[PDB]
Every structure is written in structure tokens, then in C-alpha cells.
Design a binder for this molecule. Structure first.
Ligand SMILES: OC[C@@H]1[C@H](O)[C@H](O)[C@@H](O)c2nnnn21
Ligand SMILES: [Mg+2]
Ligand SMILES: [Mg+2]
Ligand code: NA
Ligand code: NA
Lengths: 1011, 210
């Protein structure tokens, strides 16, 4: 039998799925959630040997250890120890598409463990082993004899070992196959690894035991009254003296209790469930659970005898909350949610797909601090603790079945096949059977990218029938099929339609109001955060806010799936697809995170934090109107902090506590602001601060902020007439402008400022020249490669039109002497195959005060792809330690991603003006800068800039960040105008029209001086 | 105080170049010691006889956005025809120019005025690259109107029939012009993208007698 090539066999002798058990034999232990003696971790050192297929496993390995075997830590992915290469692939299956078969060469992992079992665990009771996750299928042996088989690498497989174990010394043998028929259902866009990558344990249950329990909470109209309902099921011999007590505690007070004998109500003609009982407790004024306040209670379920003797006890946290859809809105406790969500894969740069407590705690705090309130388990059920953590910290969870068949043609080939119904159903039913008790689970999902098939329809109904407390969603086959309660498209744009045949992505605002459509819309995946992205993020959040039935979405995604590799010096570098020999691969497409693998935020994260704020502000006269978007909490840990600053300089500040009801308003009157004298723009900045530490944030945490332009006094006072007058030196080669120690060289044959001097110190390494290109970002590249050109992606339109091959042709270079200045007029035309792409007409004006005024006027041919930028660049010889600027900051910010940035005076170390995108691209730009300061130099105007030790050319030509070398001097790009960065998706052009440089004629002006 | 603001001269210089004379001006428009608009120009007259105007306007962020940013002057000439390379033939404005086509248009002068019973700003054409009137020609990238009635007269006249032809011809050339609204006529209805709010504005003209 080759069970791994048969989708009709997904397990053998596996025990029924159920919620988290611990088999406590003490009520208190169960109540306070203490460690249980009946639950032993078997994690730790194991004995492992790799094989190229199962037929190559020697038959001796069941009986005793293999000498060749190494000692490795479990859980782990064996790819992370070096036994084979992890494979990154997106759509194309990592194996040949030939269902249900796998390759004959099937990397087989052999896990074994010698371990003790106590006398008391075998004398009576039941002893099972629990594998929380095994990728992708495995056979199990114990002391030589065969036990069973299990599939689905994301739910725990459990086996009864009672009759296999012997007192004292025992030996497990777990043969794990990388590929199985299960792998057809596991085509998620991630690294393809394997092994025993989740906890392994031994659970000891009594012979008469709690076998399952379900918790449900129904409410009245206003949520002042509730009934909790617990169905308790048992295995073992039923007895007239057996009893169950379900007790609800909040903290240390017992709020409610019920005791009953077994014997359910009559369910049909044949009677009721004798082996079950339901306990109904009333709870007055329950503390309701939400992501805003995760009020938890504790339920203890005691199986015991009438005379008082405890047999065992299980428990769970209970959050009192209702989740329903009504009149087209998703409500929680009667209130219409606004989902600030994100997708999160289970990923660690070192350990692979092995999850730990610390990293999950890390992720939650980061999410929560950045104004996230919901997470989707893309695309599989999570490590079990994850749900405990969302229950307690407060995050809305979407629990997703481990089903994805993206690679199939068509996408629904298996999910429409009835012979595949069995395999799929276990992936759904076991999810619900495990996780149905967690308050954080608000929505079930049927899987991902598996088209739409009758199996989805069957299962959707299944869920609705078993658990009516949660809506069901699924994206496949158009995002709005009959298998979903929620229109959950992926990467549907806000205004722009994408009318693909059969499975169109409509604009979300139009989607809602299609004839006959009534459901709510919440994107399961939006704002692809691949590299320098999240451009156009503000548009979504404005749309979410305006449209009641637009209730949010989940960003894609949380963390870059980059892995750690080492060079010859043992130095760590971030790696992606193909970097392990894995082929075919989807290169960088695994890194779509808002954070780097080590949890360092990308500049994109702050944009999210801003847009997902829970407080909204408006300004009228000198009244600030604060609006709470909280549904349940009062602003009981917030105070408002305003300041008014003129071109960086603080003028006035204040501090007013916040006292807004959920959905409420608070008017705040700013005192009479002392009207300043000197020229410049006054800016008001409000920010919301949390004075107190919470479970998730440190004291003083900023949760919201905004700016408005107040008064502006324009500058009207002439600069005092110069003492000196600059001197022109003409030369067939050069124009040389001198003044004091300062000198300016304009090469008369190129037409650019070739060199500047302060005394005898050179300033420029490469002359100052126009630039109309940038190092392609990921959203500029898309899915375009060397071997597969996509002529529609931005990088390819620019390449084919010669933007990168364009050379400046001098049209005009003249010098003129004025009363108090020298004036150079220059003109250039950039061309390619005789097509004039750009014309650049400049003037440089150098006066006695030693200030140079550059006037740029660019023309762009209407028929050329709109340029990535219009600006100037040069390589400065100077290398300073700081960058000081008056403009939008402090973090990287682009035209369509600058809402989160504030106007102010920003001082930062040079290094922070570069963003280490693992695939390097144009980076570090700051927008709306009026003044930039670098060492001796100062530029004034209204511009965007980036500044670093890497050229645009280097970033362009280098595949990984770890291969970039600092260059001689400092590269400066000063853009009059910069194109947007897109990011609605990363596989077709996504830069919205209003952020492409289409004007035709552009104007900017600079002043360059040495202060 | 946009209607009441008077120009104050900040700068007015002359320079002789190799083949041109360059005039450099700078004005502030003020009201109650508040500066609304700054206008920094250069005029470049070379041997060919062409006047290269360059205008650079600053607009206080806290003033209500202007209706336009441009130059006007009353020409002595009264010509019969008007000839332009741009959007036409009919009156078109920024938020109402989809109906107009880009082409070379020749109309009589009276067609450049729209007889709205209640007199207002009218007869603008947008996206103009060349304007011909009598002996004069303006080249650049602008919006303009040209009629026998000043803005002042239109503003002060309540009925079309009371309007009278002024001596010479009034020309309004705009780098930029605010949209005209219409969603209704009782509240502000000019959408944000047709409001002149950029703060700093640039346009360049060339004035020759061909
Ligand atoms: O980051 C690539 C993403 C990701 O795999 C998503 O799960 C999926 O919706 C998708 N389809 N096309 N590209 N993607
Ligand atoms: Mg099978
Ligand atoms: Mg996929
Ligand atoms: Na909404
Ligand atoms: Na991806």
C-alpha cells in the first residue's frame, strides 16, 4: 500500500479531533491554567537520518537506532539543518502535476526517540501521542510495531499508544514523507519544507474521560443578559453515578455553575445522546470580549462522581461575544466592525516554519502597536498557542482550512472532484473541531486559491450547520460565490475595475452595489507590501471609512519570508527563492512583509499605523474635533498633545486629556496662538499619547497623529545687497565662477556644473546632471524576468523606450555677466534611436552672497512612458555623519505614501537615509523638503530627495543587499517630481494616474549654498 | 482682499546681455499688511524681437485659493478675427473642457464672448499653445480670453444689455484658472482638483510681433 499516493486514505487509526486538552486531575489547576502532569512535552533531542525515498529506509530502523543518524532538535524543519534545499515556489507545484501521485524520489525524514514511560501511565488509563504538525505525511511506529498514518501538515495527528508502550524504556519511529497526495492540497505561496515542525507530546486520559466540549454564548437585545451553553461529551463506560459540572469564573470569583448527569435531550425518534450533557448557566451583565477589551472568563468542565470524587477536568478561556451579519454588515456585539487586519504566515528566518512563544508575542505587540486589530491565518490553521494569544491580547482571527490548490488547471480541478471531497472535509472539520472554542476566532475560512467547486459549497454548508456563531468566507472562484458570507476579494482596487473574464476584480466601491448584491466586503488580501510599496494605501482607508459596507481588509503580508544564509566569513545574509539551488523558483516574491524576517519595520508599516488610527481629526477655526472610531472602549488611557511650529521652531504646545465615548466627539479649543513675526509656514501637529503601559504597549506610546497648515507669512524682505561680485573666467573649455574662496566650474562641452571648490577642496566626484530614471522597485518590475519579459510592467516600458540608455546632447551653453551675479544658461536633449525623450533647460545664478540658484524646466514627450522622476543628481566627495532637513519625515516617504510622515526639522544619521530592502531598489526618498543640510552644503526649494553611499546604478545592478558596497563619497538625488510607488498589487502596473508624471512640462528651482 | 489688494514693488532691475536685455521684477500683493501673492518675473528681449516672459507666483497657504493666476492688459488694437492653437472652438474651462477639441481655430472676435444674461467671467479657452490677434502673437501653455469688456465692467454690470464696448481689446492670459463648479449653484461646488492650491505656480510666455 502506498497511502501517500491515495487521497482516499488520509489517516489510519488516528483519534477524533477535539479542542485543547490537558487532562488535569485537579479543578484548581484547570481553572488557573497551570502545567499538567498528564501532558508531557517530548520536544528536545531526537535521532534523525535522511533518505532519498522511503524504499531506501533499512528495515532495522524500526527495531533499533541507526548509527549513521545525527542528533537534532525537535520540532524543526529538516531543511533548516541542511539535509535538503527548501524550495520557494508561488503557483507552480514543487512537484509534477499528476494527481494523486508524487515523485518516486521522495525526500524521506526518519525521526526516532528513546524515552521513558512511568509505571502509573500504563496500569490504567489511556496514553496517546500528539503531533501538533507534521509536513506532509507520516507513518508511526512504537517499539517496532506499526501504529498508524496521518496527513494534513497543519492540524495535530493523535494516536492511542496504550497497548504499544511498555514500562520504562520505549522507542518511537516516525517516517515522515515530504511529498504526499496531501501536497496537492498544500500549494500555499511559501517555502516548501518538511519534518516534525510542531510540538510532540503524551497525553494521559482516564478510561472514562471528557472526549469533547463546545462552548456557546447567546445574548439578549442589549447584551446585559447572557446564557452560556456547554455541551460535554464522553468516552468510556457510562455510569449512573457519573456527573458533570461546568463552572464559570471571572478572575477569582465564581460567577455561575451547573451540575448534571449524562443524558441529553431527545434529538429524534430513537432518543437522545446518552453520552452527552448540556449545561445552561445564566450570566447577568457579562464583561463582553473584543479586540478593544479582551475580557476573558474561565470555564471549568469537571467529570466526576456524584459523591464528590473528581475524575478529570478540562478548561478554556471564554470571551462573551456575538458575531453576526445583518442588513449587510458584519457586527460584533451589535456593532459594525472596521477590520484593520493583516495576513501572517508562520515564519522565522532561522527556524523555518517552526513557531515559538516569544516570536508570537513579538508579532502581536508589533501588530497591536501599529493599530492592527485583526489577523488572518494564511493559509492554514496556526500553532495552537497563537489562538490563546489572540484570545488574551485581543485580535480578531480568521481561521483558514489547510486547503490550497493554486497550481491546478483549472484552479478548481480537485475541489470540484467528489473523490477529493473526503480529503478536503477533514481539513475543514478538524479545524472547526479544534478551534471552535476560541473567542478570537470570529470568521472561518474554507482555504485559499482553489477556484470554486461543489466541495466548497458542501463544506461551507457543513460549517454553517455545525457552528452558526461565525460567518464563513472563501475567496476562490470570484470572491463572491455561494460559498462565502463576505465578499472577500484579493487586491481589488478602490476606484479602478479589473474586468477579467469569468472571475473579475471590480472596484470595491462598485462591487458593493452590483444588482442583487447585499453582503459586506472585507478584502482577504490587499496592499501588497512587497519591498518599497504600500503606495495608494490612504485611498483604501478613506474608502473603508466612507462606505458602511466596506469594512476593511487584511494587508499582505506581515513578515518577509527571507531565510538566513552565511558567506565564507560566517556572516549572515537574507536569502530568497533560488538561493538554495531550488529551481524553478519565484525569486523575491516570498518577501512581501510589513516587517523584515527579524521583525524590523519597513517604512511601509508606519503608513499603516497612521491610516489605521482609531481617532479621527478635523480642524475648524481653532477648534480640533477628535472622533473616536472605537466600538466599545472609552478613551480612558489617552491624552492629546498639540504643538505649533514655524519652519521647525516650536512656538506653543499643550496637553489635554481625551474623554471621548466610543463613536463620540470631543471639541478642543486651542488658546489664542501668539502670531509670530517672521516669514514661514506655521504647522499644527496633534498626537495621541497613552500615559499608561498596557499589556501590549509601553507607557508614552503614540497611537495617533495629524498635521494642518495654519497661517503662512510669505517672505517679502529683499536680501541685503551683496558686498562682493562674482568673477567670470571664460575658456574654450570652461566657464569658471569665482567668489571669495568659493569656485564653480561649468564644463562648456558637457553643459553641467563639473566641479565646485571651497578653498582648494574638491566637492563633486561626478558632475551634477539631470536624472529621469530610478532603480526599479519591485512594483516597477512586477513578474518580469530576463527569460520572460512582461512589456507592460513599468521597468520594461522604460527600458524599451531608452530611458536607461539615454545620453544628454548639449544644445546651448552661454555665460552672461550681470550687475551683481553671473548667469549660465544651459539646454540639453536626451535622445534614443533619434527620438527626443527629454529636454532640460536650466539657468544657474550665482550672486555676491555666494548663493547659486538653479532653475530647471523639463519637457517630456507625450508619447514616452511617463518618467520615474524628474530631478538632478551628483556624487558629492564629502561624506558626513548626519542629514538634517526641513520636510516630511522622519521615515522614508513617497508621493503616494507620505500621509504618515510629518513636516518638521529632522536630524538623522546618514545610515537611516538608506532602506535595506533585501532586493535593493530606489529607496529612502523624503518628500516636501524645503531645506536639506549635508555637511557644509545646503539646498533650499520644494523638492524630494534621497541620500546614500549607493548609486542608483549600483542598486539597480545588485540582486541582494548584502552585496552592496559603499561608494566613494555620497550620492544625492534631488527630485523636482517623483513618480508614485504603486502596490495595490505587484504583478501589473499599479501606480494610480494622479501619481504618474504626465504633465509634459515641469518646473522646479533650487538654491545651493555653503553655510 | 483679493479684489482690493494693491501691488507693492519689491524689485525692478535691468541688465544688458550679449544678445538680449533682461528685466527682472518682483511684486507683492497685500491687504491689511497681509501678503497674499508674490509675483517674480523676468522679461527677456533679444535681437529677434521676442519677449520671453517668465512668471513665478507664490500664494499664501492660508488665503482662499485664487480664481486665476495670470496677466491682463488692455490692447490698443481692435482686430476682427481671433486665431489660436488649442482647445475650441467654444468656451471651455478646466472642469469643462472634454467637449472641446485641440486644433487651429479662427473665429470672429464676438464669438470669444459669451452673452450670459448675467455678466461674468467668460469665453476662456484652455490648453492654448499659440494665440494670434492682429499683429500680436503669444506662445506658451496657457488659458486665455479676449473681449471688448474688462473683468471690472463684467463684475459691475448686472445685465448683458447694459454692457458697452470698451476702447481697445481686453486680453486675459492665465497660467492657471480655477474650475467653474456646477454640482449646484448655492454652495461651493468646484472640486478639489480644479482649485488653485499648489501654493507655487509657474508659467512662461513668449510675446512677439510676427
Ligand atoms: O505575493 C504573491 C501573492 C500571494 O501569493 C497571494 O497569496 C495570492 O493572492 C497571489 N496571487 N498572485 N500573487 N499573489
Ligand atoms: Mg493518502
Ligand atoms: Mg497561491
Ligand atoms: Na466602512
Ligand atoms: Na508572496
Amino acid at each position: 500500500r502506498r497511502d501517500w499516493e491515495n487521497p482516499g486514505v488520509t489517516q489510519l487509526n488516528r483519534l477524533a479531533a477535539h479542542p485543547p486538552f490537558a487532562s488535569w486531575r485537579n479543578s484548581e489547576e484547570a481553572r488557573t491554567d497551570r502545567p499538567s502532569q498528564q501532558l508531557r512535552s517530548l520536544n528536545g533531542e531526537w535521532r534523525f537520518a535522511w533518505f532519498p525515498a522511503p524504499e531506501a529506509v533499512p528495515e532495522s530502523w524500526l527495531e533499533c537506532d541507526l548509527p549513521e543518524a545525527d542528533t537534532v532538535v525537535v520540532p524543526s524543519n529538516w531543511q533548516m539543518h541542511g539535509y535538503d534545499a527548501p524550495i520557494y515556489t508561488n503557483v507552480t507545484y514543487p512537484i509534477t502535476v499528476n494527481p494523486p501521485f508524487v515523485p518516486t524520489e521522495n525526500p524521506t525524514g526518519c525521526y526516532s526517540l528513546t524515552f521513558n514511560v512511568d509505571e502509573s501511565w500504563l496500569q490504567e488509563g489511556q496514553t496517546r501521542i500528539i503531533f501538533d504538525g507534521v509536513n506532509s505525511a507520516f507513518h508511526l511506529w512504537c517499539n517496532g510495531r506499526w501504529v498508524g498514518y496521518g496527513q494534513d501538515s497543519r492540524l495535530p495527528s493523535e494516536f492511542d499508544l496504550s497497548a504499544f508502550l511498555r514500562a520504562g524504556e520505549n522507542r518511537l519511529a516516525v517516517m515522515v514523507l515530504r511529498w504526499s497526495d496531501g501536497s496537492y492540497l498544500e500549494d500555499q505561496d511559501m517555502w516548501r519544507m518538511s519534518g516534525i515542525f510542531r510540538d510532540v507530546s503524551l497525553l494521559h486520559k482516564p478510561t472514562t474521560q471528557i472526549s469533547d466540549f463546545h462552548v456557546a454564548t447567546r445574548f439578549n437585545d442589549d447584551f446585559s443578559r447572557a446564557v452560556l451553553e456547554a455541551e460535554v461529551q464522553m468516552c468510556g463506560e457510562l455510569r449512573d453515578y457519573l456527573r458533570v459540572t461546568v463552572s464559570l469564573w471571572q478572575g477569582e470569583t465564581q460567577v455561575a455553575s451547573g451540575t448534571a448527569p449524562f443524558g441529553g435531550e431527545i434529538i429524534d425518534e430513537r432518543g437522545g445522546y446518552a453520552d452527552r450533557v448540556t449545561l445552561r448557566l445564566n450570566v447577568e451583565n457579562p464583561k463582553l470580549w473584543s479586540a478593544e477589551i479582551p475580557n476573558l472568563y474561565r470555564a471549568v468542565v469537571e467529570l466526576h462522581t456524584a459523591d464528590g470524587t473528581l475524575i478529570e477536568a478540562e478548561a478554556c478561556d471564554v470571551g462573551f461575544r456575538e458575531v453576526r451579519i445583518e442588513n449587510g454588515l458584519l457586527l460584533l456585539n451589535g456593532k459594525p466592525l472596521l477590520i484593520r487586519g493583516v495576513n501572517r504566515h508562520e515564519h522565522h528566518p532561522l527556524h523555518g516554519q517552526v513557531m515559538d512563544e516569544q516570536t508570537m508575542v513579538q508579532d502581536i505587540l508589533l501588530m497591536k502597536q501599529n493599530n492592527f486589530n485583526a489577523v488572518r491565518c494564511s493559509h492554514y490553521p496556526n500553532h495552537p498557542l497563537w489562538y490563546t494569544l489572540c484570545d488574551r491580547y485581543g485580535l480578531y482571527v480568521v481561521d483558514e482550512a489547510n486547503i490550497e490548490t493554486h497550481g491546478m488547471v483549472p484552479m478548481n480541478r480537485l475541489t470540484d472532484d467528489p473523490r477529493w471531497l473526503p480529503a478536503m472535509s477533514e481539513r475543514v472539520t478538524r479545524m472547526v473541531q479544534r478551534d471552535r472554542n476560541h473567542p478570537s476566532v470570529i470568521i472561518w475560512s474554507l482555504g485559499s486559491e482553489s477556484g470554486h467547486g461543489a466541495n466548497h459549497d458542501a463544506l461551507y454548508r457543513w460549517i454553517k450547520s455545525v457552528d452558526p456563531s461565525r460567518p464563513v468566507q472563501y475567496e476562490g472562484g470570484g470572491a463572491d460565490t455561494t460559498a462565502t458570507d463576505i465578499i472577500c476579494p484579493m487586491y481589488a482596487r478602490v476606484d479602478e475595475d479589473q474586468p477579467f473574464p469569468a472571475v473579475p476584480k471590480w472596484s470595491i466601491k462598485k462591487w458593493l452595489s452590483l444588482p442583487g448584491e447585499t453582503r459586506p466586503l472585507i478584502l482577504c488580501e490587499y496592499a501588497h507590501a512587497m519591498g518599497n510599496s504600500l503606495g495608494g494605501f490612504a485611498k483604501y482607508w478613506q474608502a473603508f471609512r466612507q462606505y458602511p459596507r466596506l469594512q476593511g481588509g487584511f494587508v499582505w503580508d506581515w513578515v518577509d519570508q527571507s531565510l538566513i544564509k552565511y558567506d565564507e566569513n560566517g556572516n549572515p545574509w537574507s536569502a530568497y527563492g533560488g538561493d538554495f539551488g531550488d529551481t524553478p523558483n519565484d525569486r523575491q516574491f516570498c518577501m512581501n512583509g510589513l516587517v523584515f524576517a527579524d521583525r524590523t519595520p519597513h517604512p511601509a508599516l508606519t503608513e499603516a499605523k497612521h491610516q489605521q488610527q482609531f481617532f479621527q481629526f478635523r480642524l475648524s477655526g481653532q477648534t480640533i474635533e477628535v472622533t473616536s472610531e472605537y466600538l466599545f472602549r472609552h478613551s480612558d488611557n489617552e491624552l492629546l498633545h498639540w504643538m505649533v511650529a514655524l519652519d521647525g521652531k516650536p512656538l506653543a504646545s499643550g496637553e489635554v486629556p481625551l474623554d471621548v465615548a466610543p463613536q463620540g466627539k470631543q471639541l478642543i479649543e486651542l488658546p489664542e496662538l501668539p502670531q509670530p513675526e517672521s516669514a514661514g509656514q506655521l504647522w499644527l501637529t496633534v498626537r495621541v499619547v497613552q500615559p499608561n503601559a498596557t499589556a501590549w504597549s509601553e507607557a508614552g506610546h503614540i497611537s495617533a497623529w495629524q498635521q494642518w497648515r495654519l497661517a503662512e507669512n510669505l517672505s517679502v524682505t529683499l536680501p541685503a545687497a551683496s558686498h562682493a561680485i562674482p568673477h567670470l573666467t571664460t575658456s574654450e573649455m570652461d566657464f569658471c565662477i569665482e567668489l571669495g574662496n568659493k569656485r564653480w566650474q561649468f564644463n562648456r562641452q558637457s553643459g553641467f556644473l563639473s566641479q565646485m571648490w571651497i578653498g582648494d577642496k574638491k566637492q563633486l566626484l561626478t558632475p551634477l546632471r539631470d536624472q529621469f530614471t530610478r532603480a526599479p522597485l519591485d512594483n516597477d518590475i512586477g513578474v518580469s524576468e530576463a527569460t520572460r519579459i512582461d512589456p507592460n510592467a513599468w521597468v520594461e516600458r522604460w527600458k524599451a523606450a531608452g530611458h536607461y540608455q539615454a545620453e544628454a546632447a548639449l544644445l546651448q551653453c552661454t555665460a552672461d555677466t550681470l550687475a551683481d551675479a553671473v548667469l549660465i544658461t544651459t539646454a540639453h536633449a536626451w535622445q534614443h534611436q533619434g527620438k527626443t525623450l527629454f529636454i532640460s533647460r536650466k539657468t544657474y545664478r550665482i550672486d555676491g552672497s555666494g548663493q547659486m540658484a538653479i532653475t530647471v524646466d523639463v519637457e517630456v514627450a507625450s508619447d514616452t512612458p511617463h518618467p520615474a522622476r524628474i530631478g538632478l543628481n551628483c556624487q558629492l566627495a564629502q561624506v558626513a555623519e548626519r542629514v538634517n532637513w526641513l520636510g516630511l519625515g522622519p521615515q522614508e516617504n513617497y508621493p503616494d505614501r507620505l500621509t504618515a510622515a510629518c513636516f518638521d526639522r529632522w536630524d538623522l544619521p546618514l545610515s537611516d537615509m538608506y532602506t535595506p530592502y533585501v532586493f535593493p531598489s530606489e529607496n529612502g526618498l523624503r518628500c516636501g523638503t524645503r531645506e536639506l543640510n549635508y555637511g557644509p552644503h545646503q539646498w533650499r526649494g520644494d523638492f524630494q530627495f534621497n541620500i546614500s553611499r549607493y548609486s542608483q546604478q549600483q542598486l539597480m545592478e545588485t540582486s541582494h543587499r548584502h552585496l552592496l558596497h559603499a561608494e566613494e563619497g555620497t550620492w544625492l538625488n534631488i527630485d523636482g517630481f517623483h513618480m508614485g510607488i504603486g502596490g495595490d498589487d505587484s504583478w501589473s502596473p499599479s501606480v494610480s494616474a494622479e501619481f504618474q508624471l504626465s504633465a509634459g512640462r515641469y518646473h522646479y528651482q533650487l538654491v545651493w549654498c555653503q553655510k
